[PDB]
């Protein structure tokens, strides 16, 4: 109200409204799902078009051979944060001959977003990210919020109507975690999860975007006829 003019102002109840407004941009964004087993980790994203002449906005970005994310909210902010991750993944490899741990990647994203919430002149990031990866401790899924809060999960969803997919994953938890050594079945579970968030529209060939990373699987994105198999 009087305390939402900038990110440097607490409200009388201890809230940061600019951060909360940045969180609101994610809720307007298109739905994207993340889930993993012990061998693989999967991203599924519902891409959004402007109209029938337009392309469908890409949702998934590769960060390294073993890591990548999906976005929901301001796309340019995802480009900035994903670029930062690419550099950090790259610094780790060049200097230490070491693949960057997914947990450490989450810590770096948290700290970068935090600085934009405590200083004058700047603004919080207006995007939510779902990071998947396979490192020395197996498969991982992270959820990033521009408040700075990063959380490690078995599965999750962000964006508009994401609550339906999140409840489904909460039910299916015991089943999909056990899908080891079977990439197609893990993706099926993800495609079924994101379907719980659809209304009026359904998953078409230029609508659906899928990514996967695992034990002997580099981070690869599937679009177009490559996802027709899962429709």
């Amino acid at each position: 109200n009087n305390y939402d003019g900038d990110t440097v102002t607490f409200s009388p109840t201890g809230r940061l409204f600019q951060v909360e407004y940045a969180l609101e941009a994610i809720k307007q964004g298109s739905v994207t799902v993340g889930l993993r087993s012990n061998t693989h980790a999967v991203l599924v994203a519902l891409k959004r078009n402007a109209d029938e002449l337009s392309s469908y906005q890409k949702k998934i970005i590769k960060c390294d051979e073993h890591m990548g994310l999906s976005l929901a909210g301001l796309a340019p902010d995802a480009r900035v944060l994903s670029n930062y991750l690419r550099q950090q993944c790259n610094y780790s490899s060049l200097v230490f001959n070491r693949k960057l741990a997914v947990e450490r990647a989450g810590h770096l994203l948290c700290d970068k977003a935090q600085k934009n919430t405590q200083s004058y002149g700047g603004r919080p990031y207006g995007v939510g990210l779902l990071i998947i990866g396979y490192d020395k401790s197996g498969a991982h899924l992270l959820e990033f919020q521009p408040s700075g809060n990063v959380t490690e999960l078995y599965g999750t969803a962000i964006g508009a109507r994401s609550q339906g997919a999140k409840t489904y994953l909460e039910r299916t938890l015991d089943t999909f975690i056990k899908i080891d050594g079977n990439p197609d079945e893990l993706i099926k579970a993800g495609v079924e999860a994101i379907s719980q968030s659809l209304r009026d529209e359904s998953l078409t060939v230029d609508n659906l975007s899928i990514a996967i990373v695992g034990k002997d699987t580099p981070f690869t994105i599937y679009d177009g006829e490559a996802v027709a198999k899962y429709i």
Partner: protein, 222 residues
């Protein structure tokens, strides 16, 4: 006074065929009269069907290859996973080298692969980034021993057709990958005999449309 440069010896050789290319190099690494390693790889697969070697001062050589490999990675990020063509890689390496024009990478760089028509390609660089597409190029310690042999046996220089006595040149017939490898092995065997910094092992990387293949051969260890 601190000398930032050194000489790690070594000799490399690139040859472009009709639909293939080879980049070869010995595996010996030295300083002065000592051997550091009998097997230290010098020719590298850099992705996108491109092989590279930066011969001379190994610290600079490793640095350049590392930065070029990195450039290939970022080319993919920035340009929708587009394949970096050999000509584009060559121009990129010029800028990497000329970027240190006044404190140069003390190396002689050669890359090999296939051009956009599928034909064999070799590019050769000086330390500060001047480059050219070539059919045949040796680099490093025993380059002066190898090139004249290649002028004669690859390009048939000074060879004429018997009976004509200098009137008709020996026609420039194309060489197979098996034929090129023979000339590479004989080039390095000969260089090993007469150059003290050449020996131990020979590693050849062959590039075709099918990808990058490796071959290794022993060289004399004295």
């Amino acid at each position: 006074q601190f000398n930032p440069y050194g000489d790690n010896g070594g000799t490399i050789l690139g040859i472009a065929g009709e639909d293939f290319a080879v980049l070869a190099g010995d595996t010996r690494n030295i300083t002065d009269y000592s051997i550091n390693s009998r097997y230290e790889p010098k020719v590298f697969d850099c992705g996108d069907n491109i092989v590279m070697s930066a011969n001379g001062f190994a610290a600079d050589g490793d640095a350049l290859v590392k930065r070029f490999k990195n450039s290939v990675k970022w080319y993919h990020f920035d340009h929708n996973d587009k394949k970096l063509s050999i000509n584009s890689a060559a121009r990129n390496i010029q800028h990497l080298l000329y970027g240190k024009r006044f404190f140069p990478y003390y190396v002689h760089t050669i890359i090999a692969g296939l051009d956009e028509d599928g034909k064999g390609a070799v590019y050769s660089f000086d330390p500060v980034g001047s480059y050219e597409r070539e059919q045949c190029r040796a680099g490093g310690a025993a380059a002066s021993l190898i090139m004249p042999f290649l002028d004669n046996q690859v390009n048939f220089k000074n060879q004429y057709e018997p009976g004509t006595n200098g009137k008709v040149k020996k026609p420039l017939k194309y060489l197979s990958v098996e034929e090129v490898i023979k000339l590479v092995r004989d080039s390095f065997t000969s260089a090993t005999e007469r150059h003290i910094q050449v020996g131990d092992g020979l590693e050849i990387l062959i590039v075709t449309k099918d990808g990058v293949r490796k071959e290794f051969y022993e060289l004399k260890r004295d």
